[PDB]
Amino acid sequence: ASAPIGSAISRNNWAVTCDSAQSGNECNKAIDGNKDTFWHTFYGANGDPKPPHTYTIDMKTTQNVNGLSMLPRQDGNQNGWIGRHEVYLSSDGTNWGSPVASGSWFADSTTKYSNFETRPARYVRLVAITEANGQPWTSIAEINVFQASSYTAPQPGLGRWGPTIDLPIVPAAAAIEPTSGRVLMWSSYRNDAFGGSPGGITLTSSWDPSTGIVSDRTVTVTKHDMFCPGISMDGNGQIVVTGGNDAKKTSLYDSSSDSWIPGPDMQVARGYQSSATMSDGRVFTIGGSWSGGVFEKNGEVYSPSSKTWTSLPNAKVNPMLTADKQGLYRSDNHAWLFGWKKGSVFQAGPSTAMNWYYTSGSGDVKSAGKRQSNRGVAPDAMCGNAVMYDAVKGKILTFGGSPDYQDSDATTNAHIITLGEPGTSPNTVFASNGLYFARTFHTSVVLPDGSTFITGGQRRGIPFEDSTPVFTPEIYVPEQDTFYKQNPNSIVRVYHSISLLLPDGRVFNGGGGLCGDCTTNHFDAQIFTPNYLYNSNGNLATRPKITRTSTQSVKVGGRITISTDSSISKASLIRYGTATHTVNTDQRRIPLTLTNNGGNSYSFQVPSDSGVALPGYWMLFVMNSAGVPSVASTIRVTQ
Ligand SMILES: [Cu+2]
Numbered sequence: 001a002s003a004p005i006g007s008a009i010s011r012n013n014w015a016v017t018c019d020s021a022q023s024g025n026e027c028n029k030a031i032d033g034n035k036d037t038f039w040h041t042f043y044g045a046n047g048d049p050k051p052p053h054t055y056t057i058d059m060k061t062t063q064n065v066n067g068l069s070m071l072p073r074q075d076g077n078q079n080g081w082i083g084r085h086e087v088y089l090s091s092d093g094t095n096w097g098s099p100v101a102s103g104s105w106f107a108d109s110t111t112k113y114s115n116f117e118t119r120p121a122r123y124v125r126l127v128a129i130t131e132a133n134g135q136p137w138t139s140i141a142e143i144n145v146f147q148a149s150s151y152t153a154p155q156p157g158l159g160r161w162g163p164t165i166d167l168p169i170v171p172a173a174a175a176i177e178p179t180s181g182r183v184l185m186w187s188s189y190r191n192d193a194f195g196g197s198p199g200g201i202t203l204t205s206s207w208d209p210s211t212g213i214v215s216d217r218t219v220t221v222t223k224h225d226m227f228c229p230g231i232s233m234d235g236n237g238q239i240v241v242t243g244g245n246d247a248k249k250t251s252l253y254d255s256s257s258d259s260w261i262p263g264p265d266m267q268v269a270r271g272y273q274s275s276a277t278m279s280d281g282r283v284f285t286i287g288g289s290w291s292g293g294v295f296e297k298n299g300e301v302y303s304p305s306s307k308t309w310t311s312l313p314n315a316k317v318n319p320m321l322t323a324d325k326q327g328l329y330r331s332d333n334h335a336w337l338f339g340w341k342k343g344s345v346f347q348a349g350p351s352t353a354m355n356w357y358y359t360s361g362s363g364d365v366k367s368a369g370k371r372q373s374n375r376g377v378a379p380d381a382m383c384g385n386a387v388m389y390d391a392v393k394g395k396i397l398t399f400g401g402s403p404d405y406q407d408s409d410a411t412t413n414a415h416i417i418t419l420g421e422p423g424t425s426p427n428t429v430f431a432s433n434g435l436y437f438a439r440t441f442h443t444s445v446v447l448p449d450g451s452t453f454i455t456g457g458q459r460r461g462i463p464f465e466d467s468t469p470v471f472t473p474e475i476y477v478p479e480q481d482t483f484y485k486q487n488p489n490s491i492v493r494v495y496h497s498i499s500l501l502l503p504d505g506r507v508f509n510g511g512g513g514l515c516g517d518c519t520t521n522h523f524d525a526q527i528f529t530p531n532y533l534y535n536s537n538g539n540l541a542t543r544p545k546i547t548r549t550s551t552q553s554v555k556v557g558g559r560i561t562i563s564t565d566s567s568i569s570k571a572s573l574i575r576y577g578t579a580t581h582t583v584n585t586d587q588r589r590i591p592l593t594l595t596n597n598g599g600n601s602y603s604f605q606v607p608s609d610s611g612v613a614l615p616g617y618w619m620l621f622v623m624n625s626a627g628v629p630s631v632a633s634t635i636r637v638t639q
Pocket residue numbers: 228496581
């Protein structure tokens with residue numbers, strides 16, 4: 001099930017309009033309170049007008065609207081199920097503006113919702129762009145509008161949330177398709193559940209930021225239910241999905257051909273392991289006792305060229321285990337892995353003990369000391385997040401999480417780890433005064449400017465329960481060593497939520513739930529627009545443009561020359577992300593040093609160490625003196 005974020009608005013005073021309505025199926029059947037009666041557009045002998053179809057409500061007064069619900073026809077017939085849709089709000093009835101929510105609803109008879117940030121309005125309009133099966137009708141048994149207890153205007157200068165993208169599934173795992181710019185999301189064998197999978201199938205969905213189209217596709221070619229997996233973008237730019245519901249499988253997503261390819265089976269069955277791309281394009285994984293059995297799962301490495309998984313038995317998982325009260329089932333999960341120099345992998349946590357993993361020969365592991373600072377040794381931080389915001393300086397920001405996977409209080413701990421050469425003990429300090437809000441199950445992304453956006457989570461980890469939610473996101477500004485609260489959102493994003501940086505510089509945050517009959521499934525995502533995209537007036541700022549790129553494919557050590565339309569002050573390269581269960585081992589940022597060639601022409605070199613400039617796809621962003629970033633240019637970094 002799902003749920004709206006507000007309380008139902010009284011339908012007494014409403015006035016509704018429909019594009020068409022067949023007698024027996026009047027506009028008002030949708031607001032009678034009877035689930036047996038429904039509005040239905042013209043059919044048969046009234047003709048069959050194709051969608052779009054529209055449902056407009058006049059609440060007569062101004063309500064602080066935060067959502068709507070749509071109960072499809074409950075008579076067993078599917079005709080008229082809304083697929084693609086848009087939701088608009090208006091205080092006047094003539095000026096709608098941009099949709100407050102849009103996307104596609106799954107093809108079933110369950111009540112569907114549109115949850116969105118609170119906006120005073122008197123008029124609401126639901127546009128049915130498509131019928132779920134491609135037919136021309138639109139039918140609605142019941143329609144409700146929800147209101148917030150109050151309305152609090154976003155504060156200027158603190159970012160903005162919206163719109164809401166409605167999806168057919170709970171996006172508990174997502175990736176950006178680098179060649180297309182689309183967001184790829186997946187659930188499990190079902191749109192809203194993973195328990196009871198016959199294994200072998202995964203439901204996916206994609207959102208295209210350019211067209212606003214949400215599409216769904218079932219993947220069975222790899223015979224893998226991809227819930228709870230390791231995810232890494234390999235050296236070739238293929239996304240490597242491992243284990244989870246089908247514990248030994250490997251599935252490859254090729255952005256180029258937009259297809260799924262069966263990969264080789266891992267040597268050890270795992271679920272909830274983290275995998276990390278290496279300086280050589282290979283993928284290392286360790287741990288993962290969620291599925292495949294509970295025992296010590298040492299390292300293994302995938303080679304994209306030979307398409308083999310090789311065991312690395314001496315890359316021992318033992319030193320990275322947390323002290324989880326549930327034991328090994330949780331203690332080897334979601335490692336904070338980072339590919340580094342010379343085939344090494346750094347594990348920053350969640351255990352207090354940090355380690356160096358080596359992939360030569362049969363593997364090795366060396367202690368890197370304890371995450372700690374002048375405030376003491378950091379406790380285990382299961383589901384805390386770790387982000388490499390400056391790969392050149394080896395800087396990793398870690399934050400949040402709790403000692404145990406669940407039933408444990410999250411903390412405000414935050415540290416900065418600075419990596420040197422593999423085998424050396426990195427320096428760790430405390431970050432500022434820690435998070436404003438203790439959280440676990442939160443997600444984060446590094447932004448073009450090197451700041452880290454942190455959002456969602458809860459104060460006490462309770463999977464599938466939307467309790468103690470943190471609605472206020474925070475940004476860490478490394479240059480100032482300061483955290484800043486941002487404007488709050490209205491949708492809880494806790495266990496099974498995700499965040500990804502979009503190529504336009506905005507953040508896509510969504511998911512949460514995936515517990516079948518629970519009412520905590522969130523079949524949506526919201527967009528957060530950081531203040532760097534607005535000018536002083538609250539309007540969107542004018543962005544620099546990258547008019548030319550000497551090349552779109554470069555070897556580490558290589559130079560790229562660009563021309564822009566305005567003088568730029570800074571540039572950064574951001575590796576494309578993948579995310580699930582708080583883990584994102586693919587994102588990282590490299591700040592660039594620019595050579596001004598005069599005439600708004602600039603060159604830069606990609607770092608020559610492929611353990612810094614990990615191979616794969618990256619986003620190039622340039623910023624003007626104002627700090628406004630361009631939309632990214634996609635660059636492929638090869639070794
Ligand atoms: Cu899970």
